[model samples]
Target chain A: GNYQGKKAIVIGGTHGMGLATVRRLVEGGAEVLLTGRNESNIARIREEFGPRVHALRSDIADLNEIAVLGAAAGQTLGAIDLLHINAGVSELEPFDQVSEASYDRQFAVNTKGAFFTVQRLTPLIREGGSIVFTSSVADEGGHPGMSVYSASKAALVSFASVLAAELLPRGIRVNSVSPGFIDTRAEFKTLGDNITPMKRNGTADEVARAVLFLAFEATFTTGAKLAVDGGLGQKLST
Target chain B: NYQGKKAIVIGGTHGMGLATVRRLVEGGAEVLLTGRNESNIARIREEFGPRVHALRSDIADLNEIAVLGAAAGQTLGAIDLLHINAGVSELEPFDQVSEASYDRQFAVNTKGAFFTVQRLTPLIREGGSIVFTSSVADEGGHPGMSVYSASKAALVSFASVLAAELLPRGIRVNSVSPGFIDTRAEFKTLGDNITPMKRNGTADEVARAVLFLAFEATFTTGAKLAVDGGLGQKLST
Candidate 1:
């Protein structure tokens, strides 16, 4: 009911958290443009949702491509009312042997890509627009072989705070949604044996709910990290 | 025997964390610095001597930190003071941040540091002192910093809650947030911004404040002092 003519963008929305967010936006009655790496997924989503949901196939990791995508969205929708950046990958490797390739792979896709994506879309975000980034409980906690990944995510946290201060003049709110371990298909493959607590990980739907809360419900909350990790991020005595 | 004037610094072997350790040793307090970096550990140990203890441990990994608590207890015999300063920072824009990166940062800086102090509370000597390294990022909102700033702010909230929780134990807990300090580790990050103090702070400046809170400020608890030369005060508006 809160969304009527609001134009929204969901990056990396082909699957997982992105897809869940897309569903939420569509259900809320906003026009959504969902992007992903696979053309087939985008095509299928577009076919199913018709004109209400638009699908675009683009690599979010490339800054140039993100600029192009932003331009295309601007041409079509004119302005964005809500934006959610939820595309990412996870890997575990020991610190002593972590490769530069791996570092670039993670940081380029996660950090660099995110930077330009928002930078390019600055004009598209109208006043009072909410920008939600998908951060993780991992950004605050420590994990072995995750130095590069953790550092990259920490950068986003820093960015959100700075951006919140900068964009206050524009009346645009920026925040992050940090979900704990979610039991996604990708996570099942990446975290084969490391799942802790509840004998399962979190769900994308749970994270999407939090995203919607920040995007529409919590008007006063900006530069906040809503931890949807079921207390997994809390300190444990051992 | 380590009880009277001994200090334990968690994540104290590098950056502002290490600088605080050096300051404690200079102030006539035996210091122990812990971290996962072997080179940092070896280097600090070489410089500080028998009074400076180096323990290799990763705060983010709960298993190793659990063992560290016991080993630190055995080595020091008793904990009279503690400082939690181990943390990480990265620069991800909003779109690309992954779940792994977020968890790792929180694990070491927020959750890991929190548990380290929680488990070590029992070992703290009577009327002991505790200090946490929080940041001005928490107070001043910025973009691309939602995670890092929030995590640091969480520490401030934790300190307030823990202070009240441990009020019955007569232990004092406080936080020292260094404004852009001039240190070997942070020089590259400071760039050329003109801080309110007109100059960046030194490691010794932060350490002196830490010592002041530990020894001189007996009645202060659940308080935070920004050693940032009025930088935080200026940014409040």
Candidate 2:
């Protein structure tokens, strides 16, 4: 709760892990604006958090929306302390079965959307500010039917590394969090516990803790994934 | 050509490590492979017929590892590929995990891997590569494999940082995360068909991945490739 007078923004923060992070920021006395693709949760967040938490309906996949968000953010907060990129969707399938449409759809929101959003919004961040990109354990995939999702996340990490090296001169830090099979939504099928070391799926708030740690506490860590897996992101070796 | 390429294969008596050694030797390179087993080392010597140096070195013991590196430095002059491939595992829950088992796994997978790389990286040529034999469990989600998983996780962490540090040297460092090597000790709880091939991956399959990262993946560093029939990818219809 030490973010007494900071300013930050969350991409796709209406619900799930993003919303959880927004709650953390707002509760800590930070002025925060959050974006969601639809208006479903807008009125609710505005009512609960009042003036400090700004909830806007904006599609991350729209380049135009990202451009306007950047400008609006600059005017609203003046300078940003953190930019959290946590937008994603996955359609499970094997390599051969992946449709070009499905492939492009995932990347549009996950890869290109996240990449360009950071590029557009990064200028508003102060020199000491930082960025955290949310990636999945599948970012370096070995699952049977998760080809596109993994590749997109894999590329996101690559971009994070290059950006980390590029922004070193400016005193800005970039890092990513890789979470294992997390049930950020209800009605999700019982995910595999056979492979998870802690034997359970993670909650959204648990992931929020990791993001805040990277954004604030972990100043020396950059371009690395602080996993929120119950230790599932590792290998047990054969 | 691999005419002057010197290579070291850790855990190379049998299974996947042995497979990697065979590949390196076949490609016309001077190869040194290590095994903790006396019988396995004997078999390798007879099979390769002195073409490859099969050593009985216990990777989990640092003293044993230190004793032979100078022998390698004197014989090979430079190392082209140093594949860290030794490890052991257990099937126990987090609370049920024993400290002894934890120490063993870490000694073999984590500490041994780290110390081995430090011992050999000076010998690696600029165009050469260093590959770690990691499992998909390094992501740390697998139930009942926490001790083993976390140890490999640290090894992977070491590899990534090493990748960034070694980038300026033009040396590529990568990891091959394999699932269910088709050894005699195969554990069959791999859930749905991971690779879509209706079977576990052959040890040779993992060896192929290591070599590719070693030589062909020129543009890749601080990266990983999955050799599990898709165990890590979560393949579905």
Candidate 3:
């Protein structure tokens, strides 16, 4: 219940689920350094939350920028209690239609970027701290037109699993949240509701809650994925 | 049961791959099997003679993969099945994992598998299928084997995507997740205690499932069949 002295670094925290996580952390009295590519969104976050929230404009896809961000994070916050990787992008295209550039772009942000971020920022995470990745429900299932996206997120989840085992002796934990059809930026609300057993889209705030829970409350849980989707991943039928 | 069929079994000189090769050969199927070991290849050639085409190929090498493609094309054209079973695991904590180890495992298990399929896909018959030798560790959280597990996990994910991509061609893709089988290294007590079946599975058992997915299971694609003795099944023991 007390995060008054905690520190956190949230990648891609400009808006949506990442922003939601940052808000909760800031509300709990935690000092956070969050990254975003949009300068306006970064400025809004700075103005909205004041000095305790350090909103920096950084693109996760650029390795040089990631290195700079890593250094800036180290200087801003010497150590952190949580490192949440929540940045990702997807272009809906069939496997045959996917170009090497698009596939590389998705993997750059979702898989390789998340990986190198951990390699850079993991040292800053204090013992007993945690890492959470925002994977997708498509990480395992066969989703048409999302082959690249699904594989990228699947690699992220796989990395989380290994990182979980690797970080076990250090007292840190790793986990992921597979969100399905989140309302962060949605269309076809009727389609989403009809397909989901819960009959509603999951709010970004709900996913944030699950993220925070894994970051703090779920001490015994590691290498597990908590689905924030409305039973879409479960493949349930009413 | 596989009479008149032709197949390619990568890493078929030993372990589960060898078991599957045995099944294929016994059932009157022609097989062109690859192995990294010269001694093992020699042994296999001696044991099976012309019944099996045992070739020496290292999957970790791209040039060697080209050679393998040429060999498979010459020896067994239009094969009915492509079994990518070549994999290596070096057990260690994540912190202890060197870049060399990481690259080696990924090169062989994930990247090698990917390009191998790319090279051999043309040889796979229209109605034929692809099966990967994935492990239960691909499901994740196995200590001392993080790199190994991740490599297999990537392979499994690629399998799903490939399955969807290959649907238009009527070619199915699937994976078999085997637990602590008695082939490579037997975990003896640990296997009995952790496995719900109270014993490690045999390589032959895994081979049966692989063959089934390759030949039967006509309706299934883009799926993983776990032959893990219920180790990964979350069954309370």
Candidate 4:
């Protein structure tokens, strides 16, 4: 419960896993500026955390808004200790039937937005800071109807690697947290638990713990993806 | 060889190398392929008729790589594909791996491949792509092929990193990690019983994987597809 001097930015921090991470940061004494596109959810977060967190309305899908967020975050917290890009949206259609709108929408929020967000907000991050991208187990392959989303996340992880190498002199670390199958009242609620090796669903708190782990404890790890999923990505053959 | 599409296949005289070269030629791609052996180079020229550029170039030698890069640029400027499949290995546990064995495998697989790409990537035109032949042992926990596996593991990491760095050039980079593929050289580091398929993959299977990444996988970069059946997947029988 002691983050005393750290400053962080949590993109898409209004709800779900992002909200969970924001909660941890605030409770731990870190100053956090979180972005979310939803107005009502922003209101809910403002009510929940009061002045302990800076909940901003910024849609990462909007490049102009991301620019504004860059400026706002810089003015608010001069040199941040962390930039966690946890924004993602997916539409499931077989590779063939994927409409252009859905594809671009997913890439806009998941890939391009995240890439440009890092590029824009990187200056606000000081030396020895860190970045965490929210990658899914779908970051790899094998799941049908997830080709585009998988490719986007794959590209994100790829960029994270290059960023890690490029930013080596700066002492900044870049890594990703990959969630395999999680229970969050989402579309995957009915997904067969038998498919995953653990035969159960992972909680948002479990994912938050891994994200927090990457941020705080993992000093020696970078340019890597840690699976917070219960062995779904591991192919354990249960 | 096709009139428009040009490709440079390193170590492209036998097995999966030859298979990929054959596929490209059949699809009308003009191919300039290299092999370390003079006999294999001459053999491919004899075997494949006139359109192929079968050159003798050793990837293990930096001078040869520089020469090959110049020659490739001269003959096949802005080529469509670059397939790096040249690799050599000696199977031994991690502790038993001699420095000579380590240098040899990494010379061709990791370091040589890295510098070769650093040299040859300039000619890979926009919209063109590169495919590396990494192996299933690349995950690095397997025994008896630690050096071999580490070399390939390094190559996979390089592919992903290159895939990012090369994205600005509009050149896609991907890898195919095959397992237990029966070829003429017979590098059966992982055999049939352990592989879940209980059968060996063919050079054509790997070739198809290469061509798919080259032509069809337009949106896919920094990705590796497994042709190892279920061995790497670890599917329960």
Candidate 5:
């Protein structure tokens, strides 16, 4: 799926899933522009990928920054061939402790940030281009302490399905790639022994491959979530 | 393969899901409850132990659910019953709704449920049962609830088609549609505004119907039980 001469903008490309997607786009020969809140991380990525890869510092949590990122990318790259919204954070807390502040904090970064990140960039996404979001497996799972976080991710899944319907007229496809517990640095630190089935968390590369399938191989697929977990989600209690 | 003696409940731990779990367990069939929450699992595990195997799994995350099923089959040797009661509900109007909320509901209720049934089919020994938790909201046209309703209806559609898909496997896939249920009613007052029965149904009532479909309805597959206390019976049109 070499995207030679194709332009792509990956939001939250500094680390985790977004970072891995950025690498995939570049390796596939797409001229990629990556964004992150950390200026140092942006600079580092820019230096590593050189000219074909542009780095921009934009905080997706802030609406104005997202707009600016959209404007800059559209102006410089013309039109994006594939736009991937792969930035998110998770917070685990009981339902009783959930406050407006905490809820908005997670929603702002995960849902609001993701909404505008895609909305503002839609103008640059070429017709027939693919748009993908990094949704989580929590959207469907029973995590006692992660209701808000799970709800936020669930919103993205709904967005993709509805947006897929809306974008169909434009020949654009919108889908979410929900990753199960991947072996990210954050997961290893926070989940510790909680990871199941495989007895180990998933690798970011495994998630990247699923994203690639949605972006390339799954031509007729839309409004779907490809689970990349190691069957940890299938167990039943007796 | 004959369910003349077994029962299974998915997402059977607490809330409506757990209520269904206990109902089946009390019905004299060996009941099994699966959930991802450790505390929820442990609570049921401690209470039921050998009779109730608590499989720690997050259905929204496919990996954990698959592992849970394998372990569950190994323990039970065969599955004659299945209930998908695990779901999430969020109240957000369309304009204010975020992508995250939509994804969360769809992932668990639609995508997760679809695959759960798919992966668990093999272990569903012949003459097994499947029940999905669909809501009255799917037909109620509730405002600020388009996404949730749509997600629920999506499962309903899946169950309808899967009813046909799983016919050869002798695995029946039906849906249980529940309406407003009073969690607390000292005197059991039946409100008249929405329900034709003029009252809310208890979780046990819905569970009873779910059990019926799973065990009693020998010829019913591709069927649905609207345990809505006549609420769903009266459609707008």
Candidate 6:
């Protein structure tokens, strides 16, 4: 009954850390609506949560879908408690190898999609409600094969910072969770195991806990990034 | 003479960029610079005729950027440095920011800088470097300048990515973050009283930092150096 009467929306909540966050909200007794692009994933979430939560098919990368999602969120849970923008896509390729399509795809999903989603949904968040973004350690520094992805996430963090300041009068705090290599995807499993100081991959539950903490507990903190990357971001050498 | 040194400075007719162009010229580097103001460009051409090439181009216009890129290639082929100092800030509360204003700031600051680098990167020699003039507001949030800060933040972020991407070419990319400087260009502030140093910085000081990153900091890339008079560094704390 922790989140009883609370309402939340998790973008890109089909699987991975997003689904983990959705599971936490559901377990905590909150009214939740989650989004995803895959039909089977949406169907699975619907079957799993049944009537307790709303599972919607929405692609954050598509502006029209975002508009539709906005309407659906407004109708289902008007003035929600938390808006977690967790949708992002990355294609790792060298700068020269990166075609225009790859660069545009990443930016559309990670940066532009996130931006317009906030624009559409910020008004729907209650006065005391908060927003949390999922950023990356690569958002700040150099990472080979992640040029466009890094920039996209970097811009996401930048927008979150500005939105925090802009929404201060409304008492709507904005923060981000910078996750290293979590087990959500095996793309960076080897790099995460070797490079991370803990020498292990992070779990989706680990990041989900951080997201919920920022959403409900960190009352005075805004525009800050909680690193859920198991000391990966702290390492200076390589 | 900084013999064999060829450089291009975007928005170099005045303020910090102008100061940098002056330093490069004084150091005997062959320089080409661009500005939006025809008068400023004319004045620069008159003052440094034949010493530096001053062109009239608007960064906010993509067509102009394309023309500027071609001009740089023809005028200063295979340059050693490409310094991006063109940006604009209109301080207004986020709520009061119109869509037009937001688009204009991002157009000139983030998008313009990105494409400029993309177009000019190939023309840069292997040993060449690039420096971006970002602002202190890029890191944190400032209430009245939300859009501007975000735009610059995106610029700095894009620069870091470009630095990583360009590393294989022996090209280094860095940024100089200037805070509360006494410039005719921008940032209207009660700056001296709030800054830890109790004084605003000079354009020449920022120019020195840009030049250092562009030419001297061989081991450094994907880094941002603050020339903020201790304002952004949490010196007091």
Best by DockQ: 6
Q: Write the per-residue lDDT of candidate 2 for residues B127-219, one digit (tens) a residue.
A: 888899988776524556655665666566556656755766788889999887676234544533445656778889999999899888989
* Residues forming the 10-long window of minimal summed lDDT in candidate 6 chain A: A95-104
* CAPRI class assigned to model 4: incorrect
Best candidate (score: TM-score): 6
Q: Which digits, one per residue and each the tens of the lDDT, describe model 1 over residues A1-238?
A: 7678878889888887888888888887888887898888887787878887878887878766887898789887889988888867656764324444665577666765776787778778998888999987766544545555665576666667777777787888989988777766575535623554444577899999898889888889887889877666666432
Give the per-residue lDDT of model 6 (tens digit) for B110-194.
Answer: 7677777777888999989999999988887777787788778777877777887797899999999998888743334567777
Error of 4 at A129 (Å): 1.3
Candidate 3 local lDDT, residue B205: 97
RMSD of each: 9.9, 18.8, 3.6, 13.7, 13.8, 2.6
Worst 10 residues of 1 chain B by lDDT: B185-194
Question: What docking tier does model 5 reach?
Answer: incorrect
Q: Quote the TM-score that chain A achieves in each candidate.
A: 0.91, 0.95, 0.97, 0.96, 0.92, 0.97
Weakest 10 consecutive residues of candidate 4 chain A by summed lDDT: A94-103
Give lDDT tens digits, candidate 5, residues A1-238.
4778778888888887888887888888888888888888887887788786888888888877876887799788989768888878766665435554675577678766787677778877777688888887665544556655665676666667666765766777777777777756565434633655555677787887788778766778876777766665555331
TM-score of chain B of each: 0.91, 0.93, 0.97, 0.95, 0.88, 0.96
In order, candidate lDDTs are 0.74, 0.78, 0.86, 0.80, 0.72, 0.86
C-alpha lDDT (0 to 100) for residue B120 of candidate 6: 82
Each candidate structure's TM-score, on Cα atoms with residue i matched to residue i, is 0.59, 0.53, 0.84, 0.57, 0.54, 0.91
Q: Which parts of model 3 are misplaced by more than 4 Å?
A: A36-50, A56-72, A89-109, A165-171, A183-202, B37-43, B61-71, B184-199, B235-237
TM-score of 4: 0.57
Candidate 1: regions farther than 4 A off:
A185-199, A236-238, B1-135, B138-177, B180-201, B207-237
Superior by TM-score: candidate 1 or candidate 5: 1
What digit string (tens of lDDT, one per residue) describes model 3 on residues B3-80?
889999999999899999999999999999999999999999999999999999998887898999999999998899
Better of 3 and 6 by TM-score: 6
Chain A TM-score, cand. 1: 0.91
Q: After best superposition, candidate 3 residue A135: deviation in angstroms? A: 0.7
Query: Residue A89, candidate 2: how far off, in angstroms?
Result: 36
